[PDB]
Amino acid sequence: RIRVYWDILVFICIFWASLESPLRIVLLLTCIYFFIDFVFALDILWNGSWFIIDLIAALPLEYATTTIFYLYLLLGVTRILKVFRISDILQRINLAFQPTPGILRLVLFAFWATLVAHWCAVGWLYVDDLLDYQTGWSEYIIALYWTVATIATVGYGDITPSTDSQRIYTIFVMILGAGVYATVIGNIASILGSLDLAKAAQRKKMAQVDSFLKARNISQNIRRRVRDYYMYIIDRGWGEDENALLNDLPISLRREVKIQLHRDLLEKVPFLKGADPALVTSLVFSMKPMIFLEGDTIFRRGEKGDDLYILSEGSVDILDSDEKTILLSLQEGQFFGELALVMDAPRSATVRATTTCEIYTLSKTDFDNVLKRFSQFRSAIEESVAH
Amino acid sequence: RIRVYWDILVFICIFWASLESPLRIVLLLTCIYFFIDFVFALDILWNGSWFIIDLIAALPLEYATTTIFYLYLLLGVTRILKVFRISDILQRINLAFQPTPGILRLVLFAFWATLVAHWCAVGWLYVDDLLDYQTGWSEYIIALYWTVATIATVGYGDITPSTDSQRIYTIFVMILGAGVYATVIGNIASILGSLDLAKAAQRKKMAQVDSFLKARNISQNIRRRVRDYYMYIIDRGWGEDENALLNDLPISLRREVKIQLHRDLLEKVPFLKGADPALVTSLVFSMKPMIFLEGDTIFRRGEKGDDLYILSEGSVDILDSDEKTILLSLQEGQFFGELALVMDAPRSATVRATTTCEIYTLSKTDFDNVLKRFSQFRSAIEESVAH
Amino acid sequence: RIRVYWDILVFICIFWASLESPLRIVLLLTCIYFFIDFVFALDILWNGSWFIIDLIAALPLEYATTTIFYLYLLLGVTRILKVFRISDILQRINLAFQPTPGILRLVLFAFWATLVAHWCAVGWLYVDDLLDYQTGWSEYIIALYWTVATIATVGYGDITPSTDSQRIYTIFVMILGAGVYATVIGNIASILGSLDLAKAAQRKKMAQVDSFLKARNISQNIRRRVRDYYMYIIDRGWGEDENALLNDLPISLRREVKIQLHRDLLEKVPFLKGADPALVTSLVFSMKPMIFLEGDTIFRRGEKGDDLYILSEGSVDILDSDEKTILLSLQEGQFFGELALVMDAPRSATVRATTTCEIYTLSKTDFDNVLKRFSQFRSAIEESVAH
Amino acid sequence: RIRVYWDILVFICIFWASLESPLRIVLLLTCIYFFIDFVFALDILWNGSWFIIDLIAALPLEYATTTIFYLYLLLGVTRILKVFRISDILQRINLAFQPTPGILRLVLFAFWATLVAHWCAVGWLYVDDLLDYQTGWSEYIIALYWTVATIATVGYGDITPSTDSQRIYTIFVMILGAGVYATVIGNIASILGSLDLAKAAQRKKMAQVDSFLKARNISQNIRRRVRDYYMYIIDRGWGEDENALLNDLPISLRREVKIQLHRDLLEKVPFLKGADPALVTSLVFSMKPMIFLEGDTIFRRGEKGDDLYILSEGSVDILDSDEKTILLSLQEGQFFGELALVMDAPRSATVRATTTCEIYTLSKTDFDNVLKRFSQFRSAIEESVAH
Structure with a gap:
């Protein structure tokens, strides 16, 4: 640099x-x-x-x-x-x-244009310097006045040629100046347009969906919420196939980045605060990000439970029998499903999404294999599982 | 809001x-x-x-x-x-x-430009206010006249600088005003172009096909009808892989939307008017949308029939033996294939598309499985099947 | 229409x-x-x-x-x-x-602009009609002179306001006229650009290949011929997956188009001139389009031959033992491979591409199955096979 | 040409x-x-x-x-x-x-514009030639002065019509000239923009990744190096699926190009200098390009080795037991893995990437099959393998 x-x-x-x-x-x-x-x-x-x-x-x-x-x-x-x-x-x-292509071009054009105006004014003076001896600032200023007015396409008509010589020079200048101005527009157009293209790519998918919905003539009640769904996803970038995306990365640094991603959700959960890093790595590789909407019956009491839900973001209601007794207002950094999964049981309680929820899910298969290996961290959460 | x-x-x-x-x-x-x-x-x-x-x-x-x-x-x-x-x-x-990107930009530019013109005119006045005491509307108006004429690149040449001071200011203004105008064009270009891009995406596929046809040098007799085929499809949006498209939606609301789609074709058919919603849901999931063209022998009398055709849109001719006796001019909301499917038989009549027809199809397998479950709605259409 | x-x-x-x-x-x-x-x-x-x-x-x-x-x-x-x-x-x-989007817009703008100029000139007159009684063509002409000069951003400065009223009107006009001109540019830009986009799509693939070659730093000897390869393919449209492309067409008309494609190569070959249409259809479905380059040893004498080559386009050399005795200068509408395929033999002669060759190929499997069915057209070419 | x-x-x-x-x-x-x-x-x-x-x-x-x-x-x-x-x-x-579309258009516009200006000036003269007898260069020059000033939208206002006839002509000219200028801008815009599009395509993938990283809010420490990773890959073009890319090429010339690619890495390695071309061809087909980063433990001493690494580009450290004794600073044209692969052994030494390394890899399976066939070139490197 x-x-x-x-x-x-x-x-x-x-x-x-x-x-x-x-x-x-x-x-x-x-x-x-x-x-x-x-x-x-x-x-x-x-x-x-x-x-x-x-x-x-x-x-x-x-x-x-x-x-x-x-x-x-x-x-x-x-x-x-x-x-x-x-x-x-x-x-x-x-x-x-x-930086964005075109920005640099803009700078260059400003640079070149500046020089052109300056030299052109001098040339004008030269022609009219032959009509005198020496000049001062006033003359130089006037030269620029004419020069710029011409280049900018404005043309006040205050100053004009008298001899053919002057006329010729003027014609030359008019041609050049016009071209310059045109190229200025060129950059502005290309830059601005490219910015729009970037945004368009982002909305591409949602737009296609919206188009479909419009063809089906679905009411706003839904379409608006659909758009919002995509918008939020876009904001998070969770819609991207993280795996496949990362799959083009040199496995060495790729893994390091993966570790950075493991870092992203690792700290909140005390289980992982007090876990070893081999576990964390293994598990992080395993964990899958799932989105739930407001009201979703994530768990149904009585039903066989086969996954741990680690609440990254959002609010959850752990409800007993009556579906009212909030056993736990479960929030970011909390985790649920462990009772049924450690006990090899049915969900002994119902779990509702309060809000939209971002949850990392651990299938029973992965859970058991992982904590089969990490039996000390099977013993860990199993401790808490008692209640 | x-x-x-x-x-x-x-x-x-x-x-x-x-x-x-x-x-x-x-x-x-x-x-x-x-x-x-x-x-x-x-x-x-x-x-x-x-x-x-x-x-x-x-x-x-x-x-x-x-x-x-x-x-x-x-x-x-x-x-x-x-x-x-x-x-x-x-x-x-x-x-x-x-809204479409750029529209907001346009508004902003109008806003800013307005302020610029106003302030610039004031500055002009200031310079010439030093040539007097106080002024009125006429002077303000004149200031704008000059200001706008300059900014818009027009330049009548009616008003010009006399002192270098004024010349300098003028040069400053000319530069700024020119730039403003350029950016105005920028938006117009970017907006208009993006609109075209949207439409291009829509025609993308058909265009590719047309290109192929042109390479093969096929006559208009067909190519025109081909285009029309795609156009109609586009109008309906039926060409979209509804399934895969919807497959990126949170299954909860996704299903709700699917229900909205079930609502779209559910009402016409008396069978479904008098069906239960578990059936409707199940069946709607099963039903496939098929397009037939004018004259199509949808059913051929004597041939094994293995699907129910529910006519969403279009006109159909149910013909007996002679292929003339229109047993039924079958229209939107009607349904056919039930005789052979309930009787496990060959089509005992021939079915021709009058027009282009949008039909939801139910394979015998799905039909039987569904109405095996919904035996009361197997009993239902079976009632009518007698004739 | x-x-x-x-x-x-x-x-x-x-x-x-x-x-x-x-x-x-x-x-x-x-x-x-x-x-x-x-x-x-x-x-x-x-x-x-x-x-x-x-x-x-x-x-x-x-x-x-x-x-x-x-x-x-x-x-x-x-x-x-x-x-x-x-x-x-x-x-x-x-x-x-x-037509191409934008073309229609251009027309509309021409239309609107025309009306604007006319009405604006009238308005100008109105203001100055208050300075007189009646006017003639000369005045109307002058009005247009001013009007157009202003709208076009030119501004000769020949005519200007004297009263504030006039100044105000002028300002109004300047704003509108400027905007109009800008929108004119808009169309030109959007139209022209879209045309380029269409062409870009066509070259897309070849361009990617060329880029690769440039990265590998391959000599022109090849890269030029590579480009030419793609160019020719593009010209023919043979590079398109005809099948998959057509697979989105209503099978009814799709087949009809397929028949049109069968028509494209059917006439030249006397075998097919004297074939029935069930055969032609069946076979046309089977035939695959293959491209050979100059010098290609299409057949090698002595090697097991398992395909018929129907020469759509190009020149071919059927050579005996010595690879010089052109047994047949085989041209468009001719066909080769039949000796070995009917005799279940090795190629008893070598076949070289003279030029670039477009050939429709019929595998022995398809050949035998087809002409097993069409044994009278197995008897047909088998006739000629004697020599 | x-x-x-x-x-x-x-x-x-x-x-x-x-x-x-x-x-x-x-x-x-x-x-x-x-x-x-x-x-x-x-x-x-x-x-x-x-x-x-x-x-x-x-x-x-x-x-x-x-x-x-x-x-x-x-x-x-x-x-x-x-x-x-x-x-x-x-x-x-x-x-x-x-050449790039638009460049040719630019040339054409320059050509046409030139002619227009010339003819227009003549027309102007004609109108005013009716006001005289004959003229000289001065008049012609003046005609151009007016003509260009008008066409370029500048308009000094020095010269103007006196008769309606002249006014009419002027109006005609103003319209045409304005249009010309607009089309000039058109090309500039379309050309410049298309250039940006090309570059955008190149960065497409990396950009998507960067976007993801930004969503995840990863530190610059990595993101910068990520970009660099892609940049280098782009520079090399190694990220392209060479195989699939080439798979659309006429197998004849395709292979010839493949041979050119075999030529690209063939010369450095003495094994291949002294190999036969059937081997080279076979092997080149087999060889896979792998990228290693600085510090990468390419081989670990003691671990089963199942691949030969031919160093195209970069520096490598062959280390014994102590991971310090650089047995060999292995550079471009060198090759490693042969000891373990010929001996069917574990890596008896550790291999670290010094720098970023481009290596062509030969799996033991391919190695053995190839040098089973090419047993004289199995005997070859096996010679050196002694040390």
Whole structure:
């Protein structure tokens, strides 16, 4: 990234120089130039033909020749040529930050446009400098006034050519300026559109479903809740096939990331706080994420229970016989199903979702195999299972 | 949604204030301001730094200070700052309505552009206010005339700078205004294009088929009818894999929606009018939607029949031996195949599609299993089967 | 389609009327109006509130009232309102022709823009009509000159407001005109882009392959020929999974299309000229399309042959022992492999592709099963097999 | 391609002629025309109605008629008509080079626009030529000044109509010019956007993964390295299912390309330098590309080894017992696993990835089957296996 920071400095220096150069026609400054070349010399150190290019730009010219003994204007070009290296700078910049395509283009266009306007105004002056001797800020300002007004397509008509020469130049400018403006629009369009495309991809599935529903002419009562369903899922990203998605990752780091995912749900549950990491790993691999909606009878009392439900998110009602006696308002970090699973029994209580619930589920098969191995952590939750 | 309605009110108030503020330079109104702040105070109630921000905007300032004892212009800024909260308002708005991306952007640009034009005109005046004392509506109007003409890229050239100061300001304005216009185009492009993309997705499949047909150089006689085939299917949405599509839905509500789909074809058929809902559910799950074209020999007399055809949509000809005697012009809500299926027989009559027909089909296997269970509804249609 | 032709007529009539109406302010014509309403009356026949709308437009007004006894200008509006029905006309038009989205939009914008310019110019006149009595063509022309120049963003600055009233109107116009122009661009962008998207889809696969090749850094010698390979395939459409593609078609018409495909390769081959259609159908279903490249040793003499090759397109060299004696320059409509397949033998000759070759292949299994059934067409080619 | 080069020449000639023609109104040149037609005559040789068209353009007209005996202006049209053939030229051009869609459009628009401006200026002159006799360069220049200023939407307002006639023409021009400019933008937008789409496709997968990670709220420590992982893969193209990708290629050339891929990794390894090509082919088909990350314990000493690892790219540490004694710093072109695989043993040493490593892997099964066949190349590496 530091290498990129170096690029930024150099870039700025080049830009400044390209503005100072063309002005030649009409102490500290000298010291500034020393700095410029000095920086360029450091660039050479940072680094065939490219060497030659950099070398040339870094050659302390006019000053040197001044101390030895329009031409300085001509010499100014030596620092301009270097600009071509931007093609590699950009690559490094993208590598550094990785932004949305077009953003960088926008920056470049702003840069180029700026230079164009400046040089064009100078050219205008040149033509009219032949109508005088020297000029001041007022003239330069006027040149820009005309220049910009023309480039921007506005055209106040305040200033116009008198000779064919001037007319010709004007025509040249009009063509170029128009093109520039068009390309500006180009970026804006491409950038903005691409942003929309990204969002469209996200909604893709839900949209298809909605379309279907519309074809079936289903009432809003449901369709709205359907959309919401997908929206929430999208927010969580749980709808993604985590497994298959991760399956393209180098198994080494893949597992490390998987461990990070194990970290995501591991801390809340005291069982896992007091579990070993081989267990945690094994189990995390096993655990499946299930979504329940408000009111869902997750467990039905009397029915054979074959899975542990670890409540990541949401509120749950553990109800006895009467389906009213909330035995437990079961919340994030709690866990249920253990009574029936450890006892190899039917659910001795009913379990209702209060809210929408995110639960990690552990089938009896996995539960038994895992805690067969981890019999000390079979002994663990079995402890609590007594009540 | 009410929370969003509150946002709308606040938004409007802010906008109004931002127009009244900059005008400061050249009773009821006071009461209006009371209302404004009052509303903002309610916003505080609706709700750290954001508190401070709202607080500031809601501070009844100039009036207070007037009763205590250019500056009022300065104080007006206190209500402007708050505008930043739009970033959250927008989120809520989208959540509320969920419109096509870009539409909201368009609105925002209209809003911002409006303010820009207003403030810019004021700035113009300021520069030329230094050329006078006070001004009236005519001057304000003229300012807008110039401002808009410039921003819109038109440029009549009626009004122009005289001093460099003015020229500079003008250049600034030209740059900004041009950019604004460009972004306006941006939205229009992105919005319109996205609309086309949606439609393209719909035709995607048919288009591929058409392309194939064109490669094979098939005559219009067919290709047109092919397109129509797909068009109709699209209209109905029947081409969608309803099952797989629905398979990503929380089984609870999924089933409820499935029930809504059961509702869609359940009422017409008297068998199902007089069926129980366990049957209906079971059967609805079983029923498959089949499309027949005009003239199709759905049944052939003499051939083993192994399915019930419930006519959702279209006209059908039940023909005896001679293939002319329309035993029954069978229409929406009618059903056929029951004779052979209940009798375990061959079709004792031929069945032709009059029109295009949407039929829900029940295989003999499902039919028998279902009505084995629902033997009272086996007894039911079997009643009618006598004729 | 005739119904659509009727729409076209009506549309045109409406347009004309909307141009004649606003002109009111400054014999045959009367008869023309009779025609207009007459046409609208027929439209009523072609057809609640829509009835009322049409009715109103078809009411022969000013003339009637003239014979009974500015106001006529006012009455002209009665034919304008009807324009709203375009929303349904467009649907019918698309159904009729089915063109690329955006094309229709372009037409609509041209239509609307035209009307806007006209009405705007009239408004301009109105404002300045208050500065005079009556005007002629010259004034109308001038109005358009200003109007268009403004709308098109050009702005010559030749004509400008003098009163605030005029300035206000101008500002209104500038805003509207600018917006119009922007929307024009919108269509152009969306249309053109969509065209590119279509082509991109076509090249999609080949492009992916090319990308791979570029990553592998393979020489042009191959990559070019690879591209060509895909290009040719694309041209033919043979790369499409015809089967799976067709598998979404109503089996009835699907088969009919399949028959059309059977027609495509059936005529050339005398075997099939003199075959029955049950065979042709059966066989066509069986035949598989295979592509060979120049030089390919399709058959190798001595090797067990288990397939018939029916040459759709290209040139083939049947070579004996020496691989030089072209036993047969085998061309489109010819067929080979029959000797070995009928004789249950090894290829007694070698077969080379001269050119790229499109061949329909018939495995020995299918060949035998088919011509087991069609033993008379087993006897057929077996006849020729003698040599 | 030469045929295309011929097109280029002809195209240029046509263009030149279309500029010279309209100028008619106000020696060597004659010889130039001879050349023009001559070239067109050659075109006829390069080649019904198209013959007639070319013929006409190639007819040496004005000169002929001059030697026989405004009208010449009229005759100039004979070379213009031919331009229509561009529709076929373009096809050939694309076939020749195959560039990004839109690029060619851009060229065409530049071409057409140029001609429009020229002809329009002439028309302007014509109108004002009726106000004089003859004109010179200055007038022509002025015409262009006005023309371009108008077309480009700038509009200085320096020149304007005086008669209605002129006003009308102007209006016509304004409309056309505006449209042209719009279409210019169209291309720019479509081209630029399509470029972005290509890149988006490339990042598609990684982006999806990143999105997931963001939803899971994983730290940068990993996400950055994840992106890098994909980036590198993309750079290499190794993530592509080479097999399946290639599976759509004509097996003949497909294999040849496969051989090119065999060439890609074949040379480094002395085993394969001194192997036969049947082996190389067989083996290359077998070899699988595997990626290891820095630090990866590729082999663990003591564990059963069942695969040969041929190091395409990267650095590897062969470590004995102590996991420090780098037995071999194993680099590109080296190979490991052979000791255990030839000895049917456990890894007698541990192997760590120094860097990221690209390795082609050969399972023991394939290894044994291959070198069972190629027992002389089983004897080969087995030689070295001694140490």
